[PDB]
Amino acid sequence: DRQVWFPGNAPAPHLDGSLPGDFGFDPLSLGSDPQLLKWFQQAELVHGRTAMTAVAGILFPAVATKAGVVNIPQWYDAGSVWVQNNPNFPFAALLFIQIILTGWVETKRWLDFKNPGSQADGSFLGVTDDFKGVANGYPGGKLFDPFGLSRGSEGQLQKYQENEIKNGRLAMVAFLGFIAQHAATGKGPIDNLADHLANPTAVTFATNGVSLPFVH
Amino acid sequence: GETLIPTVGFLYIAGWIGTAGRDYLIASKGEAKPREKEYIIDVPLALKISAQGAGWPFRVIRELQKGTLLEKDSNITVSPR
Amino acid sequence: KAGNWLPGSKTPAYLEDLPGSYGFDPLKLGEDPASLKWYVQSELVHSRFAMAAVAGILIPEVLKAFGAVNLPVWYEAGKYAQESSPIPFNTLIALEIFAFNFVEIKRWQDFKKPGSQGEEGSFVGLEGFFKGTGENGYPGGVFDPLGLSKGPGYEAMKLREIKNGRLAMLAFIGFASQYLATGKGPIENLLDHLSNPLANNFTTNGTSLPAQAHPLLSVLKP
Amino acid sequence: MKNFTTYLSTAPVVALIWFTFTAGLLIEINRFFPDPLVFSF
Amino acid sequence: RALWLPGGDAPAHLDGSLPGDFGFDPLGLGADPERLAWFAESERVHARWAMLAVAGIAVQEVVRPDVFWYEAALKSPMPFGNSPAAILGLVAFELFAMHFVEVRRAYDFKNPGSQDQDPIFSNNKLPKHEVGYPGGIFAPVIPGDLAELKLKEIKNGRLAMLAFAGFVMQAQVTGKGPLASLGDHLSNPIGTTIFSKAVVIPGQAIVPPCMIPSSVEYHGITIPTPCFLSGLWP
Amino acid sequence: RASWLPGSEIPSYLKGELPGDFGFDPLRLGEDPAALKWYQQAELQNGRWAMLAAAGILFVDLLGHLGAGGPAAATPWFKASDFTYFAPTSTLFIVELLLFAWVEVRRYQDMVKPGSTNQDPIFSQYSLPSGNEPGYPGGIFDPLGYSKGNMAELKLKEIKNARLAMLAVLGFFVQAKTTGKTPLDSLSSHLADPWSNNVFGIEHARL
Ligand code: CHL
Numbered sequence A: 001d002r003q004v005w006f007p008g009n010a011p012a013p014h015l016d017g018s019l020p021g022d023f024g025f026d027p028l029s030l031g032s033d034p035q036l037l038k039w040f041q042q043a044e045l046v047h048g049r050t051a052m053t054a055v056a057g058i059l060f061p062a063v064a065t066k067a068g069v070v071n072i073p074q075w076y077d078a079g080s081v082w083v084q085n086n087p088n089f090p091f092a093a094l095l096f097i098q099i100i101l102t103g104w105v106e107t108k109r110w111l112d113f114k115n116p117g118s119q120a121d122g123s124f125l126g127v128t129d130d131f132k133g134v135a136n137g138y139p140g141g142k143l144f145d146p147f148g149l150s151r152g153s154e155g156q157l158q159k160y161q162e163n164e165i166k167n168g169r170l171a172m173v174a175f176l177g178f179i180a181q182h183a184a185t186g187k188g189p190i191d192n193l194a195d196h197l198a199n200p201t202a203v204t205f206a207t208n209g210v211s212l213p214f215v216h
Numbered sequence B: 001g002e003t004l005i006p007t008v009g010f011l012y013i014a015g016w017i018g019t020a021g022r023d024y025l026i027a028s029k030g031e032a033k034p035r036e037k038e039y040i041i042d043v044p045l046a047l048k049i050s051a052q053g054a055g056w057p058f059r060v061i062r063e064l065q066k067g068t069l070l071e072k073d074s075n076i077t078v079s080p081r
Numbered sequence C: 001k002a003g004n005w006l007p008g009s010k011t012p013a014y015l016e017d018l019p020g021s022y023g024f025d026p027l028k029l030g031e032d033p034a035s036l037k038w039y040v041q042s043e044l045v046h047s048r049f050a051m052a053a054v055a056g057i058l059i060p061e062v063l064k065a066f067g068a069v070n071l072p073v074w075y076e077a078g079k080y081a082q083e084s085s086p087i088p089f090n091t092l093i094a095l096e097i098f099a100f101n102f103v104e105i106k107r108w109q110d111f112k113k114p115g116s117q118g119e120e121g122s123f124v125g126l127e128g129f130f131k132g133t134g135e136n137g138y139p140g141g142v143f144d145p146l147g148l149s150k151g152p153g154y155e156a157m158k159l160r161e162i163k164n165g166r167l168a169m170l171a172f173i174g175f176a177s178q179y180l181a182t183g184k185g186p187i188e189n190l191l192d193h194l195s196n197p198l199a200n201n202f203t204t205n206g207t208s209l210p211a212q213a214h215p216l217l218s219v220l221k222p
Numbered sequence D: 001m002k003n004f005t006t007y008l009s010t011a012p013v014v015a016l017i018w019f020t021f022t023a024g025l026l027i028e029i030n031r032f033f034p035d036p037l038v039f040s041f
Numbered sequence E: 001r002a003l004w005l006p007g008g009d010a011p012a013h014l015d016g017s018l019p020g021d022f023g024f025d026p027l028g029l030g031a032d033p034e035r036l037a038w039f040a041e042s043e044r045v046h047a048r049w050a051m052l053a054v055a056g057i058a059v060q061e062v063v064r065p066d067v068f069w070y071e072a073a074l075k076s077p078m079p080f081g082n083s084p085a086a087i088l089g090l091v092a093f094e095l096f097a098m099h100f101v102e103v104r105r106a107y108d109f110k111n112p113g114s115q116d117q118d119p120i121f122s123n124n125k126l127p128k129h130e131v132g133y134p135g136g137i138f139a140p141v142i143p144g145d146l147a148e149l150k151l152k153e154i155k156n157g158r159l160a161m162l163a164f165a166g167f168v169m170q171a172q173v174t175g176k177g178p179l180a181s182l183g184d185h186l187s188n189p190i191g192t193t194i195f196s197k198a199v200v201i202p203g204q205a206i207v208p209p210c211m212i213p214s215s216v217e218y219h220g221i222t223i224p225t226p227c228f229l230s231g232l233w234p
Numbered sequence F: 001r002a003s004w005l006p007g008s009e010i011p012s013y014l015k016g017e018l019p020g021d022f023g024f025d026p027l028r029l030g031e032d033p034a035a036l037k038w039y040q041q042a043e044l045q046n047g048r049w050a051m052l053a054a055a056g057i058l059f060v061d062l063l064g065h066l067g068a069g070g071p072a073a074a075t076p077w078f079k080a081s082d083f084t085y086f087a088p089t090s091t092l093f094i095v096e097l098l099l100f101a102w103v104e105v106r107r108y109q110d111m112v113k114p115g116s117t118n119q120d121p122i123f124s125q126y127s128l129p130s131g132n133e134p135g136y137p138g139g140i141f142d143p144l145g146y147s148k149g150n151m152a153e154l155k156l157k158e159i160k161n162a163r164l165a166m167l168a169v170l171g172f173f174v175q176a177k178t179t180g181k182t183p184l185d186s187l188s189s190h191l192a193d194p195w196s197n198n199v200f201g202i203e204h205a206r207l
């Protein structure tokens, strides 16, 4: 069959290769229920797209900061810097605005999950065709896909779906690495990369100080 | 604020809990295996019924006025006197 | 149905033909038909009371903001009226109790038996005032002297009354909570929000978000 | 996964989750609002 | 047909009907046909605006070598009004005129042949044409056949779009006009390219600073003038 | 078919039946036929009162500027209530309210039932002609023979001038609120230097 995460091991029997990024990886069998599988597919897609946006918004400002062009604060300090530099914008007001806007869009996504195509009735400002949804976790339409990269050809859509899911998984692992590297070095990720590129034989996890708590 | 407002708060929460339990029992009575839902909880149904217990006094007072809150004495078993 | 309060949700079937219905009953309070009739009447009475109250607060407040008149604000208007009132407090309360006992018993009796207050002998000769329209919460008679319920736009006016009523109810509760949290008038609150909407809202009044419940308020500050 | 969620729906597991939530809510209320004796603020 | 990459295969949604169709769509942006028509109109208007802009930049750098085209708005003439706030009137006039003409063009696109009549004089009427190619009074003379001229137009427009991107980026990295940068490249070909003053290796990175100031004070407005993604420069 | 936006879709309930029908209803405000009839009557009433208001504001403005009027025309239209007349402000409002009550109750009785109020109440021989539109009366309201000779064309001119007058009166109201100047002063300031004295710049200077 297809390529699997553990060569020589059969894929999970509830994973038949229809979903993008299906490598048969479910050792805990969390996706046995098809409805729970659709829910977890939406979870993986939302997590991966959020991670991709977050990793880009961490990396490109940090790359620009490393070159000396700008002085954008590191990702672990940007909330503090924003609060100290914006006394007229309280934290609670910003949190309330974020919560109501995200609640609107996520409740629309949730109600589409419960009943697909139900947001297509024109109740939101007359939007009908763009809120119908192409597949589970893939809305599409003229609003979410304005360049029409999903409406061209089927094979192009499957290729882009594979690209999206694999880059999303890579970005999720990258954000986990960001957390672990900040907790171990106290520096940004591009700072860590520059330190590794400067002298890679001595700049390792074994020399940060916390991954190996002993002296050695 | 020492006893009276705590009395109102407790009575509201206690009626909430009792009405949620009654609604769950009545809903489970209509199933094919009514005893099954009493020890294997229908968690989505219990969460939906539990959230609906906020409006318990309106529904309970209506059932009291309608006569549907109480079982008739002819339908309840008793011991010989 | 005027619409759906939650697009995509399954609206209850008993709210299909009501005026001002968006299918909103997540607590299933109106599932019983008798409860639904009683709550339709209750929503209409609350709506009209809030409508008149919000008018009597906002229109004097807007005229004061424009400088047309100088009337006392709504949270203190009881004090200045009672000092210049020829009728003192206790007899005003007693008269209000008597009058509202009479008129609300008449309204209640019409709710229980529709058209009963318009039959012969229901009043002392003046029962034609209250013949009723045969509809729950829409009395007519003296209460519709211009007779615009017989017009073509009766159903649109029912929808207009209910939606403005819900807006007025939320507006009066907003007035009360805004006074209890900020201590100022409603137009003052509106002008403070318009001057600096990021910093002047409920998140900075010191009441709506208690400090003990939200420890991050004192931490994430300049 | 269906059988595992059915086991989590059994009465002692549901009781454990519910009483953990209720006890935690009471504990965190008494932590955030220490010594509540009367309804006064 | 002529392909952007000879020996390659054109995508199936580019048959060759459009002018300048060389089978270049590796991302599949035009695979939707209505999106292809909209993007064809967008490419035409972008090409014509870039052609006019490149010609104007070249002419007004030849005519006035003392005025930077990037900074030309700060030293622009004011033939209308005796106040520094007269720019807002010119902005309003331009917004009205462009709203009218672009609504006319857009409604020609959505409804072909609807905007062919003069709204003032009902005798004047544009003849029937294709979408995006009005003709009539807009084209009093056509020196040659239409298809070859369309190919010439789209080729010159793509060259002008690339040229305007080059003009902008060279203005950021050199702080000077196009032909002055061309003369500096002709003086020292080996030491004036982008490969000369910009090198990134894993060890270190050398990034040329941008000579355009980050902001300017235009009658108390403080217009921001950010260098375009200067943190991502090589 | 003439329209406000050529090449765009027209609502199905606007088919040229109404005078001045250019299909302009982006909000779909008049959908039920009864609401559309009320809005036609309201457009006619607001437009005619706006035509009268535009004439009355423009006549005073040139009289005050040229001095051809008196001290009354010297005051602005928004300050004309501070002028002293023979009667105080309270009584004039009451008598005009009574006269308007009579006139508009007659008009509304025609609106509810066409042809109901067509006879002189005190003269049984003086009656309006039959076939009267709710918004288009006859008889003494048209003392000259003007309703022959393209009635359809004259309705279009009426509604056009009515819309222009409504926009002009709204411009009077808004320009008095922002600039605090009479309409002729605003026209002269625009004709002084239009590229800096317009809605842009002035409102940017106001801020
Ligand atoms: C809607 C009713 C209502 C509300 C919300 C208020 C609210 C207020 N009044 Mg006010 N009043 C109200 C009705 C009346 N008041 C007054 C006479 C005064 C005076 C003289 C003064 C106030 C002042 C005040 C303010 C001081 C706070 C207070 O006294 O809380 C009262 C809060 C209440 C909720 C009052 C209870 C109203 C009640 C619910 C009405 C309905 C009761 C019926 C028996 C309904 C029973 C159920 C039915 C179905 C049988 C506050 C803004 C004073 C203030 O500014 O000084 C500090 C002030 O000096 N009021 C009269 C005259 C009889 C009322 C008539 O109903």
Ligand SMILES: CC1=C[C@H](O)CC(C)(C)[C@H]1/C=C/C(C)=C/C=C/C(C)=C/C=C\C=C(C)\C=C/C=C(C)\C=C\C1=C(C)C[C@H](O)CC1(C)C
Residues within 6 Å of the ligand: B003, B004, B007, B014, B015, B016, B017, B018, B019, B020, B022, B060
């Ligand atoms: C079970 C359940 C079921 C469902 O679920 C629902 C629910 C609700 C939850 C429930 C039901 C029920 C029943 C019906 C009950 C009723 C009863 C009786 C009959 C009463 C009497 C009888 C009663 C009476 C005697 C009573 C009482 C009286 C007394 C004097 C009191 C007093 C007071 C109070 C005020 C409070 C404060 O603080 C204090 C005091 C001082 C203490």
